[PDB]
From a paper:
Inherited mutations on the GALT gene results in autosomal recessive, classic galactosemia (or type I galactosemia; OMIM #230400).
Our 1.9 Å crystal structure of the hGALT ternary complex offers an experimentally determined structural explanation for the majority of galactosemia-associated mutations in the context of bound divalent metal ions and dimerisation interactions. Residues 49–63, corresponding to a surface-exposed loop involved in UDP-hexose binding, are disordered in the structure, suggesting its mobility in the absence of this ligand. hGALT is an obligate dimer, where each active site is formed by both dimeric subunits. Electron density also revealed Glc-1-P in both active sites of the dimer, modelled at 70% occupancy. Thus our structure represents a ternary complex in the reaction path of hGALT, after hydrolysis of the UDP-Glc substrate. Compared to the bacterial structure, this phosphate is displaced by 2.5 Å in hGALT due to a covalent bond with His186.
Author numbering:
A (entry chain A): 28 to 48, 64 to 366
B (entry chain B): 22 to 48, 64 to 366
Amino acid sequence: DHQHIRYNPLQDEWVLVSAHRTVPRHDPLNPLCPGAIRANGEVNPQYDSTFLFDNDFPALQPDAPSPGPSDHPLFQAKSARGVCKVMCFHPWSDVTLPLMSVPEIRAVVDAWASVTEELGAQYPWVQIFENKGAMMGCSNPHPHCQVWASSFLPDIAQREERSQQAYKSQHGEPLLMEYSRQELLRKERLVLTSEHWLVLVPFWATWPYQTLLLPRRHVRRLPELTPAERDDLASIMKKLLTKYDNLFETSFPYSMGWHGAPTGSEAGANWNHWQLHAHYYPPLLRSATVRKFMVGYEMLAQAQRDLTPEQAAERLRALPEVHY
Amino acid sequence: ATFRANDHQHIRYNPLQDEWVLVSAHRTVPRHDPLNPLCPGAIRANGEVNPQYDSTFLFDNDFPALQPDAPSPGPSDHPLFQAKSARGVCKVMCFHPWSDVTLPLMSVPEIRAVVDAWASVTEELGAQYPWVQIFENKGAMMGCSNPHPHCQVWASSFLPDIAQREERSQQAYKSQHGEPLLMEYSRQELLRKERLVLTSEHWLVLVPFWATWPYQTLLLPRRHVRRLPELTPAERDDLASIMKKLLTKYDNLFETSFPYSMGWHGAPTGSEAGANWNHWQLHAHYYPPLLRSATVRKFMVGYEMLAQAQRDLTPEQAAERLRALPEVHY
Ligand SMILES: O=P(O)(O)O[C@H]1O[C@H](CO)[C@@H](O)[C@H](O)[C@H]1O
Ligand SMILES: O=P(O)(O)O[C@H]1O[C@H](CO)[C@@H](O)[C@H](O)[C@H]1O
Ligand SMILES: [Zn+2]
Ligand SMILES: [Zn+2]
């Protein structure tokens, strides 16, 4: 364990490794609760599973004029269109994914597949993400995620498209399929393995207990998961997130999201280089209250970490799967 | 429908670091503490006692992220598992002996002292390391735990990621156009005016066209200058002055001590300092988190982490607001 730098081939980034160093179940005023009034005056149904609605304060609208063409190579702007939705995971405000049952989480997975299929018919990128915890600026504790679909391929998606396309041309295999194969051989960064899925701490991880979740089968997009794969996803997510809560015995904050092959038009397109995966980016470092700050050097030079990915994976493997 | 950047959503390109951003336009510290290890006279974690310094003070970080000696990792057996060596030194630089001052509260001569110390440490460590990263982390909101006025300096044997991104873009730009990227960018922003914050004889501050943080700024010299030590005395005095004006505007924006991370980017140093770096232009970035008040910040989370940076306030609105703020501190 000596200081060194490690490369992220998926997003083309180096990281410095300095190894040498109470929510009520229901609130009629919470606009995500069953029966509650949203900002546009609509009343939520008495839903008993997941619930999808249009964000009343959306970052993207479906209609917008395009900016003019760019008159200078340093001042480039392009059009942007999209739709932003909110997805409640469960009717109870006082539950989170790790406290939910496997069938309930399977309902979440089914709703993720449905909204990807639905919005993917019109938009080339559908970004599902969850922002969990006030530490991630989440102001509403009801269990949910957001879905932003966009007419442009976002920056990170462009980076992963570029690296995966390059990797499959150079080596004949999808980047993340070879990565899964290798981490199964190497063992030391695995967190969980199941029949259809694996969870690991990536070699190039930047956040302390960051994980990568990906299926064992080559799968380009979330809707292609079979029922067995979806149930197994629900199970393995429940185990991962329960480990996360047990790490510091608290409701573990994070941002997470799904990356799969671009949607929109598929005619004349080849996405075999893509592999479906999810990233988890948790801020906590040493306790329920001591976090990692991505500031200063990390903003001006390069991401930095003290805990090695292998130490983090070793700690995550040791944690119980029974919630505290 | 006619497009208007202040009215309609769009995406903008950062050509310096090759990044797109979504613009959703449609939306008490005691002066002295004997136990504060950055104060004059105080004891540090390694047992050393600070001198009774009356200006800046430079010392080795007692908890450094980089050490000057380290073994190199083995060669990689696989293209997905690449590791390289890392060596460097981490220093801490106090700006001033008084803990209750910040840069905008200091006099121009005192800030000029900071500039001179930045140049000295860049020259000294740059003789041995190809990258010397000066940066300041100001405010608990940026995880700074010590309110004493200071910055850090991490010098490294490797060229850090962001530096590689800016080396690549500036090299390409000068190859294609025959001028340094940021020199043309400065000329253009002087012509376009709408994103300027401050102009002085030798320097300018603007909200970059592609900015991601709400009141983010870019500070750069009007002359083509590759590295900080090359600034003349007049350029250094004027840097001190314009920084005092910028940081005072920042403090006046929400009438609070404005948090931020900031740092300097210059041509790589080390063994190849004598190579051709004419495509480089010295500059500084300011990345402040505050969004709408002294307490309401931007969170770079969720979509920003999984897809793309996003902002509501346009760079032009931010710059207009900054230009209107007084240069006299509240
Ligand atoms: O030196 P500090 O204040 O202890 O550390 C702080 O600045 C460093 C450089 O940006 C970061 O690596 C840390 O995340 C941050 O907490
Ligand atoms: O949707 P919210 O909770 O209003 O907003 C939050 O999630 C968004 C998507 O990551 C971010 O752009 C915001 O910075 C964050 O505060
Ligand atoms: Zn990804
Ligand atoms: Zn820069």
